[PDB]
Antibody, heavy 119, light 110 residues
């Protein structure tokens, strides 16, 4: 069974950094893309970009260029999202979402989400 | 202000059918068949319900269906049940090799 397990809730001050993890089980982590989606409280889903688990190359959405870093540790089947220079507007739930084969523009499995609260 | 336009809310009584629309442009919804629908109970992860306009993942009942006409996709939920009450989001591939979401529709079951 396919599953994405994310790390716990975070509470940070403005200017700090935060690293969120998304551990994949139930398939070959390196066979499918990993995408990142933000949802500010009460708002809709926003696509942050994706990371190729084939090569490690990250591709950021226009709105998420600069302070956001997608990375991988394939040896523990884990994708990471780090947010730098945290600001109040970053308070949100962040999801990882697997790209459904063959082209990965459908997200068939989603992590449970990680709340980040910036005080 | 999202790229795809959805009605903010929709309502129905149990057993009825409700349709939620998702209007994009020829650059996304109309230009490709990679339109998806996700069901989100608030505070839980989105769940894939429809992909590639009309395909259902295994385990999703046949009450959920999807279609498209021009630049507008549609998700239909027939035989409405109380557990269908949730937020529904559409998404689409774009000609810029990105994915865009709709603003979401709150579906209430009376």
């Amino acid at each position: 069974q396919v599953q994405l397990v994310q790390s716990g809730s975070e509470l940070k001050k403005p200017g700090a950094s935060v690293r969120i993890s998304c551990k994949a089980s139930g398939y070959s982590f390196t066979s499918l893309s990993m995408n990142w989606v933000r949802q500010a409280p009460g708002q809709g889903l926003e696509w942050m970009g994706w990371i190729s688990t084939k090569s490690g190359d990250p591709t950021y959405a226009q709105a998420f260029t600069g302070r956001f870093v997608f990375s991988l540790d394939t040896s523990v089947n884990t994708a990471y999202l780090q947010i730098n220079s945290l600001e109040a507007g970053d308070t949100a739930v962040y999801y990882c979402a697997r790209g459904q084969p063959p082209v990965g523009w459908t997200f068939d499995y989603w992590g449970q989400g990680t709340l980040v609260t910036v005080s | 202000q999202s790229a795809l336009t959805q009605p903010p809310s929709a309502s129905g009584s149990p057993g009825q059918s409700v349709t939620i629309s998702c209007t994009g442009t020829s650059s996304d919804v109309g230009g490709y068949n990679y339109v998806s629908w996700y069901q989100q109970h608030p505070g839980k992860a989105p769940k894939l319900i429809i992909y590639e306009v009309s395909k259902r993942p295994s385990g999703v009942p046949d009450r959920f269906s999807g279609s498209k006409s021009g630049n507008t996709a549609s998700l239909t939920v027939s035989g409405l049940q109380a557990e269908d009450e949730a937020d529904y989001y559409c998404s689409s591939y774009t000609s810029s090799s990105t994915l865009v979401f709709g603003g979401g529709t709150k579906l209430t079951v009376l």
